[PDB]
């Protein structure tokens, strides 16, 4: 399937160490980097009903059986790590490294520069919209 392709790439970044299973320690840091801040008791429950066998971690078969523009609004909220209404170069770089993707200084600076309409060196919501 085509969906397999998507579920395979997600599993990889959730599975930070790549031993083949998602721990709740891994699931938590994945969600820290998505801008969330949940607690271990929440994290454990989420693991606890994807965890079909009941061995305390998520493997691919289990991950895969859990199957079922707006993605820009929500996406802005992830970039703006400190909630101040603006994405800085530092936020962009830090937030994307934590999502696996290693941007060069040059990539970062191109991104901000092309999105930054008013020239303050940061990207606000509307600016983000015009870019996307």
């Amino acid at each position: 399937e085509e969906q397999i392709a998507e579920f395979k790439e997600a599993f990889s970044l959730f599975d930070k160490d790549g031993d083949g299973t998602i721990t709740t320690k891994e699931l938590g840091t994945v969600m820290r980097s998505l801008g969330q801040n949940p607690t271990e008791a929440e994290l454990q429950d989420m693991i606890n009903e994807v965890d079909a066998d009941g061995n305390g971690t998520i493997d691919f078969p289990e991950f895969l059986t859990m199957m079922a523009e707006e993605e820009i609004r929500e996406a802005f909220r992830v970039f703006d790590k400190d909630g101040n209404g603006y994405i800085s170069a530092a936020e962009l770089r830090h937030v994307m490294t934590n999502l696996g993707e290693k941007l060069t200084d040059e990539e970062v600076d191109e991104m901000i520069r092309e999105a930054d309409i008013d020239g303050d060196g940061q990207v606000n919501y509307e600016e983000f919209v015009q870019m996307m």
Binding site: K8, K102, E110
Partner: protein
């Protein structure tokens, strides 16, 4: 073969350069020579039915192709190691970033200058095609620079994970690349050859000059439908300074019928690449790329990728 000794015996391993889907790339240094490489750790599928990891069949194919390649515009393979969990590729270190990212730092770019980079890609593809190798994933992120701080940067084509030797037996099945760059024969599940790379080159060239993507639609379906229909245009918005020669180059590559599509040899004799007189030559020097839109495109592409990543994590996080 795949060397079964411990790579750490022979290499110092450095910082992480990339974080692929079932792969990590780290910088490494060969101890004996002091020379730097990239080590790509490809995770093997742990059992036959597991959809996680890369099959041995796929890894051998990629390596078998890589071992054969020796050209200044294509990445070279130095050695290969294998442990229980991974196949470790010791590759030429290609650290200048993507071509488009380099170009996007420039004030201006003429068609002349653009073809100097284009020429290198075409020489690398002519070399591969002469060895009957189809890349099948030619797109701007696979066109890198060895070193971006020289006066004449050198193109390296990378990422041979979809590449095949063209032979009666299978060019096919895990051939699915990026919609905006795949030829109609790929989208329509028809015979594939060397010609699919030539289409990809027309799409790259189209974006090089304009900062627009020829067949892109709002969705993945429209995109694939536009590829299948060869439905594109040269919009005046993007292409008002683009030379007739360049348009014709693109036009003869963006052709449905793979047999009527220019070959790599045709493309190198084409007067946009190889002017026959000064007229064609000066025209190339007079004629400049839309750099405002090109920068917008390179940057938007990276923002589009990051969002797409976040949105994917987000869907599953719920």
């Amino acid at each position: 073969v795949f060397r079964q000794e411990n790579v750490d015996d022979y290499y110092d391993t450095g910082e992480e350069l990339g974080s692929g889907q079932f792969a990590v790339v780290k910088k490494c240094r060969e101890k004996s020579t002091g020379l730097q490489y990239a080590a790509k750790f490809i995770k093997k599928r742990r059992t036959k039915s597991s959809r996680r990891g890369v099959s041995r069949e796929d890894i051998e194919r990629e390596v078998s192709i890589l071992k054969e390649i020796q050209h200044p515009n294509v990445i070279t393979l130095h050695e290969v190691y294998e442990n229980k969990t991974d196949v470790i590729l010791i590759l030429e270190l290609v650290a200048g970033g993507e071509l488009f990212d380099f170009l996007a730092e420039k004030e201006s770019l003429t068609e002349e200058e653009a073809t100097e980079f284009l020429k290198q890609i075409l020489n690398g593809v002519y070399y591969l095609h002469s060895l009957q190798i189809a890349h099948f994933d030619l797109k701007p992120e696979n066109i890198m620079l060895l070193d971006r701080n020289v006066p004449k940067p050198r193109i390296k084509i990378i990422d041979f994970g979809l590449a095949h030797k063209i032979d009666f037996g299978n060019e096919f099945k895990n051939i699915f690349g990026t919609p905006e760059f795949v030829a109609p024969e790929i989208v329509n599940y028809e015979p594939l050859g060397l010609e699919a790379d030539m289409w990809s080159i027309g799409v790259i060239t189209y974006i090089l000059l304009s900062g627009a993507s020829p067949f892109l639609g709002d969705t993945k379906q429209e995109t694939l439908a536009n590829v299948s229909a060869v439905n594109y245009e040269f919009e005046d918005e993007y292409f008002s300074n683009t030379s007739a020669l360049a348009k014709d180059f693109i036009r003869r590559l963006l052709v449905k019928d793979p047999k009527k599509r220019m070959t790599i040899q045709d493309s190198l004799q084409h007067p946009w690449i190889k002017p026959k007189d000064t007229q064609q030559a000066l025209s190339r020097k007079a004629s400049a790329v839309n750099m405002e839109k090109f920068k917008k495109f390179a940057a938007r592409k990276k923002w589009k990728q990051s969002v797409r990543l976040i949105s994917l994590c987000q869907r599953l996080s719920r």
